């Protein structure tokens, strides 16, 4: 309920003006130097 | 001469004299290397490795692959369609159960890093070795390579996570989020916004079809958010994408203020995104 209202308004304002980075934005892979931070492991093992 | 050498080699392979075939090929290859006839060495070693692998002699096959990679380094072989093609061809013959499968793959990726403009390796090669690693049960490495791969890799990455999720027989919001968030964070980290949106769509589309959760689509100015009534984490994660796109500190702060818990669970990731997209130290 209230969450729906927040998400809807947030999205409306976040896109009021066109975002600095468009949806089609792609930093050339050859220019990537940092992969960010390690993500945690999934809390389950993988079954092959 | 080389053709004759290969003929004798293949003959020994067919007769099952693997030891002799292996020993003689390395001796002749050694000679080409000493003569600095690297192209001759590469052709001999490459065909030799392929022959052993097709004959199910993994030990001798991988041994020659390592030899091939060392000469690639020695000869300063640049990463391109031809040099990569030889490796892709060998990978197709590698049994996912080879004891040293991982080391062979690492050697290939390392060479592509060293002789290309890609700090983390060639994306085309990544698409191929990523699938081989998955087959060999090296799931986190497969993920990393697919993340650093091509568009086809993005599709394979979504399949990996989707299939994994369906494996754990658990659809708690926290669990579905553990899988979904990896697509969102990884593509945000390497700034491939288009891949983030596509993978996101495929994953959510599939989740909807499979489990039929309660939801309502919210569309604004060409953007869409699938509001889940019982998957608040998924709502938060979808909003992250648009927020980083805006690079607006205010929205970032507003989003986190509304999702306090999730902001704590993803504290480390959000801190990185804070500096990456909002210039927040
Ligand atoms: Hg964000």
């Amino acid at each position: 309920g209230p969450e729906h209202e927040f998400v809807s308004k947030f999205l409306t304002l976040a896109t009021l003006t066109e975002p600095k980075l468009p949806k089609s934005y792609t930093k050339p892979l050859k220019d990537v130097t940092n992969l960010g931070v390690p993500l945690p492991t999934l809390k389950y093992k993988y079954k092959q | 001469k080389l053709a004759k050498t290969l003929q004798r080699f293949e003959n020994k392979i067919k007769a099952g004299d693997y030891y002799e075939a292996h020993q003689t090929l390395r001796t002749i290859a050694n000679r080409y290397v000493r003569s600095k006839s690297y192209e001759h060495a590469i052709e001999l070693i490459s065909q030799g490795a392929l022959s052993f692998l097709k004959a199910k002699q993994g030990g001798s096959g991988t041994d020659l692959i390592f030899y091939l990679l060392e000469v690639y380094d020695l000869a300063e072989v640049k990463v391109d369609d031809i040099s990569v093609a030889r490796l892709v061809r060998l990978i197709a013959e590698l049994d996912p159960s080879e004891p040293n499968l991982k080391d062979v793959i690492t050697g290939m990726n390392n060479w592509s890093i060293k002789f290309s403009e890609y700090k983390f390796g060639d994306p085309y090669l990544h698409n191929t070795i990523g699938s081989k690693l998955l087959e060999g049960d090296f799931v986190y490495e497969a993920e990393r390579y697919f993340m650093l791969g091509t568009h086809d890799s993005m599709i394979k990455y979504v399949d990996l996570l989707w299939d994994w999720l369906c494996q754990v027989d658990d659809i708690e919001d926290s669990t579905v989020a553990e899988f979904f968030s990896r697509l969102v964070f990884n593509y945000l980290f390497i700034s491939n916004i288009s891949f983030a949106h596509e993978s996101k769509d495929i994953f959510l589309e599939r989740f909807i079809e499979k489990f039929h959760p309660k939801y309502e689509k919210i569309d604004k100015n060409g953007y869409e958010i699938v509001f889940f009534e019982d998957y608040s984490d998924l709502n938060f994660l979808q909003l992250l994408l648009i927020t980083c796109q805006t690079k607006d500190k205010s929205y970032f702060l507003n989003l986190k203020n509304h999702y306090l818990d999730f902001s704590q669970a993803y504290k480390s990731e959000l801190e990185f995104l804070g500096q990456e997209y909002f210039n927040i130290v």
Side-chain angles (χ1 to χ4, degrees), chain A residues 1-4 6-8 10-19 21-48, chain B residues 1-123 125-281:
Chain A
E3 202 198 328
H4 188 297
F6 171 89
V7 173
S8 178
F10 185 93
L11 177 62
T12 302
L13 293 170
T15 62
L16 212 200
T17 177
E18 66 165 353
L21 303 177
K23 281 199 293 296
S24 57
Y25 185 77
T26 298
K27 187 184 200 301
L29 189 51
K30 70 176 186 63
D31 295 322
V32 176
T33 59
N34 196 314
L35 299 181
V37 300
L39 300 179
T41 51
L42 281 174
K43 69 177 184 175
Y44 292 107
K45 69 171 179 59
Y46 178 76
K47 228 292 175 295
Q48 64 176 314
Chain B
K1 171 74 80 58
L2 180 53
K4 179 61 62 182
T5 294
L6 286 169
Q7 184 183 70
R8 290 168 180 149
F9 172 75
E10 296 304 321
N11 176 268
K12 295 184 183 59
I13 289 299
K14 189 53 188 297
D17 301 313
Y18 304 129
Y19 177 80
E20 178 61 7
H22 182 71
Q23 186 182 70
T24 183
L25 181 146
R26 290 201 62 121
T27 298
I28 295 177
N30 291 172
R31 231 190 303 296
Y32 283 134
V33 173
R34 286 200 290 287
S35 296
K36 300 181 67 60
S37 301
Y38 305 130
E39 186 50 49
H40 284 294
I42 288 175
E43 293 306 340
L44 179 62
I45 300 172
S46 183
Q47 292 298 149
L50 205 298
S51 298
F52 277 116
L53 294 179
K54 291 197 297 192
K56 312 313 174 186
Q57 299 305 300
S60 290
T62 59
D63 179 67
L64 295 186
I65 291 183
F66 287 120
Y67 193 175
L68 175 65
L69 291 172
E70 186 272 333
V71 176
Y72 257 29
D73 188 275
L74 182 59
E76 290 182 291
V77 179
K78 276 51 188 176
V79 172
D80 70 8
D81 57 302
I82 296 171
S83 52
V84 169
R86 291 204 192 80
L87 304 186
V88 167
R89 193 177 179 195
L90 290 162
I91 289 170
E93 304 300 322
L94 279 173
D95 183 321
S97 296
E98 283 307 312
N100 56 355
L101 180 75
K102 190 63 170 63
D103 287 325
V104 170
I105 293 301
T106 294
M108 294 185 168
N109 187 55
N110 280 340
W111 158 77
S112 75
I113 287 179
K114 194 173 183 174
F115 296 100
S116 82
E117 297 182 299
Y118 295 101
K119 183 174 181 293
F120 302 104
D122 184 70
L125 180 65
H126 282 173
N127 186 240
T128 300
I129 61 184
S131 294
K132 180 61 65 175
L133 288 171
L134 186 51
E135 279 186 54
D137 200 24
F138 297 106
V139 75
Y140 288 103
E141 200 69 64
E143 165 173 55
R144 182 187 173 86
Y145 286 173
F146 286 157
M147 164 186 97
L148 297 168
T150 60
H151 187 275
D152 293 322
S153 298
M154 178 277 287
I155 298 296
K156 293 178 174 183
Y157 183 21
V158 174
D159 290 333
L160 179 170
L161 296 178
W162 176 253
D163 295 335
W164 194 343
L165 171 62
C166 295
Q167 265 178 40
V168 297
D169 312 301
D170 173 20
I171 47 69
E172 218 169 3
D173 180 34
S174 62
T175 292
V176 178
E178 269 190 45
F179 293 93
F180 186 63
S181 63
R182 306 183 74 81
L183 292 172
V184 173
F185 288 130
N186 282 326
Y187 285 129
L188 273 179
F189 291 158
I190 67 170
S191 296
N192 191 151
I193 300 304
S194 60
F195 275 20
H197 276 283
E198 290 189 62
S199 63
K200 169 187 67 66
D201 293 338
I202 301 172
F203 196 89
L204 295 183
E205 280 176 51
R206 292 185 179 179
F207 181 63
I208 297 180
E209 286 304 84
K210 183 84 172 182
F211 309 104
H212 299 297
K214 293 291 90 69
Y215 75 88
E216 296 87 18
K217 292 187 176 182
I218 299 171
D219 299 72
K220 301 292 184 180
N221 304 299
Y223 281 81
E224 184 179 74
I225 293 298
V226 180
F227 179 77
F228 292 103
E229 295 189 58
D230 308 298
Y231 289 87
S232 188
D233 203 327
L234 274 46
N235 294 325
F236 167 74
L237 292 170
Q238 294 176 71
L239 290 180
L240 276 188
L241 243 180
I242 320 304
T243 302
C244 289
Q245 276 179 261
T246 67
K247 302 190 71 175
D248 187 300
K249 243 186 294 293
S250 296
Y251 302 149
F252 184 51
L253 214 166
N254 297 326
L255 184 58
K256 294 192 299 177
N257 283 170
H258 186 275
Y259 290 107
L260 292 182
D261 277 357
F262 305 143
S263 295
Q264 177 63 193
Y266 303 121
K267 209 240 289 183
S268 54
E269 292 70 24
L270 292 173
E271 276 185 51
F272 190 85
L273 292 174
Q275 70 184 53
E276 171 174 30
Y277 293 95
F278 310 89
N279 195 59
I280 296 175
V281 190

